Design a protein around this ligand. Structure first.
Ligand SMILES: Nc1ccn([C@H]2C[C@H](O)[C@@H](COP(=O)(O)O)O2)c(=O)n1
Ligand SMILES: Nc1ccn([C@H]2C[C@H](O)[C@@H](COP(=O)(O)O)O2)c(=O)n1
Lengths: 316, 316
């Protein structure tokens, strides 16, 4: 079945995943070096073995393409994936004047009442980002996140480079180019930023009139992250294909450190006892073509009949 | 056998390699997305099915580690791999006053007498690089080549960053880090340089006290290039392992566009009918440890009993 590579990867780190300790103090089972191939012509690879929220993926991806670095847009679409970082920033800001909030991720998970103070303080912040233009510009701006990295790579000579916009014109004019690469890995910022990008670099390849994309992902959360990671780059693949009047080949996913947090073994095992279903079918708006000006309504998912979602603790 | 992954990759692009046209006007058979795993504990992966020159690899690698960008060092060790680029540069230089020399790669290959003028003019240049300090500094300096990219990545604030030197200290202090990445892909220079790096980015991974490395290679010459490409990164892997008092795991080779030039089909087919042999054993100098100060004599290859070399035309 289409998602089988995913189930086969989860399966394997259960068999050969040696125990690896890590940054987030929650143990992991790890493997290094892996590759998955998805034929995007068989269907859209949104896992059917567990409900995964397309909405979060769609808004987030668009956010990237727009060249956005501001949380505001996401909240504006009920997307709270990136909040934690914009919050962490304001909480350190001297202007912040409230409860201790230190290590809030760890502390909330281990304290029912602290998690209460946290969520109230957060809702506050998110509203302030949404309403205070100045506040937004100050704390709603992540800065060095994919959208900037893809669409505005700052040079040494001050100027900015729209990698992704140049790679698409390079594909329109030189499909057969072996240098259709886009990178999110800047040696200059990498040691200072909080979360160096997970999806280090991706590459395009056009042959037979079909476009495929390879993604290099240095680190990976098998249960909570890969399911999304997949549909984010498989969606990008159609989006570029649509823009370039091209077909759709494969989404090839290469991993560096693929891992399974110890606190997710029972969850992965249950999902593993599930039996896949036919894949959902992606439908992009025919008329509209320049993908950067796309909005939620232009990408339509069909026939997604998932299994019930599976809840699990995060690693922090 | 150890090199079997290599023979299995060459084999496959013969079966499924669709025809892809390219920059070097010589047709290719191509595949996109592939991965090979080599257990460096079984032996050093220098192909036994065809003599490959370790000397060229060893000098070149050291050249990289030294942070060198100057051709002089290589010539000084009879290594002429990079000449063509330093030559191309001088030939365009107004100071150059000799024969037409345009498209010399194509023109020499297709003209016995032109190739004569070329080789005489080249020997000249190489000597001038070796003897004229000023000439060397001016034309013997490639500038943006791995050695600089690895060991001196220019920032926007002028300063330089020794990625590789920082990654090794990061491994000495944080083996279990999922961010031990080194990149040669700079979005800022990439569109101007002649040959954007082939070996885009590599990553380290330490587990069980064994160090492994994954390399992402966007483009690849299966017959003439991969054989080298392999021993260059498998050697780097021991070199870092030695420096860090670590063991040796696997060398994982992930490819983007792997290809076989049409003008090499008979050559690859003959090699394919060869039967591998036990692998050569790499012996690094026990006393010496800081790999950056290494010299040819510190790395010793053993038991390399190759088949006769196989000559073939290059692609230009
Ligand atoms: N969509 C996501 C979000 C996060 N991660 C995870 C993987 C690691 O758990 C951490 C990234 O690695 P590091 O901790 O070294 O920064 O983030 C992931 O794979 N996919
Ligand atoms: N050691 C080497 C030297 C060269 N190449 C080849 C692969 C391609 O033929 C070209 C690089 O890609 P591009 O032409 O897109 O720059 O150089 C390679 O694989 N290995």
């Amino acid at each position: 079945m289409l998602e089988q590579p995913y189930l086969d990867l989860a399966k394997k780190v259960l068999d050969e995943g040696h125990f690896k300790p890590d940054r987030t103090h929650t143990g992991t089972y790890s493997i290094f070096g892996h590759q998955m191939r998805f034929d995007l012509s068989k269907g859209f690879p949104l896992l059917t073995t567990k409900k995964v929220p397309f909405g979060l993926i769609k808004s987030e991806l668009l956010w990237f393409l727009h060249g956005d670095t501001n949380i505001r847009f996401l909240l504006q679409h009920r997307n709270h994936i990136w909040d934690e970082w914009a919050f962490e920033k304001w909480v350190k800001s001297d202007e912040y004047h409230g409860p201790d909030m230190t290590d809030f991720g760890h502390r909330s998970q281990k304290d029912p009442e602290f998690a209460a103070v946290y969520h109230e303080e957060m809702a506050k912040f998110d509203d302030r980002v949404l309403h205070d233009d100045a506040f937004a510009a100050k704390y709603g701006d992540l800065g060095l996140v994919y959208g900037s990295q893809w669409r505005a790579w700052h040079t040494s000579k001050g100027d900015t480079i729209d990698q992704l916009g140049d790679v698409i014109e390079q594909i329109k004019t030189h499909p057969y180019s072996r240098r259709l690469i886009v990178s999110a890995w800047n040696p200059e910022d990498v040691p200072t930023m909080a979360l160096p990008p997970c999806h280090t670099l991706y590459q395009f390849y056009v042959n037979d009139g079909k476009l495929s994309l390879q993604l290099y992902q240095r680190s990976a959360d098998i249960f909570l992250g890969v399911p999304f990671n997949i549909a984010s780059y498989a969606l990008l693949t159609h989006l570029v294909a649509h823009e370039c009047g091209l077909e759709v080949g494969e989404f090839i996913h290469t991993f560096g450190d693929a891992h399974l947090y110890v606190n997710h073994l029972d969850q992965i095992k249950e999902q593993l006892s599930r039996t896949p279903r036919p894949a959902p079918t992606l439908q992009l708006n025919p008329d509209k073509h320049d993908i950067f000006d796309f909005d939620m309504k232009d990408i339509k998912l069909l026939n997604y009949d998932p299994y019930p979602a599976i809840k699990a603790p995060v690693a922090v």
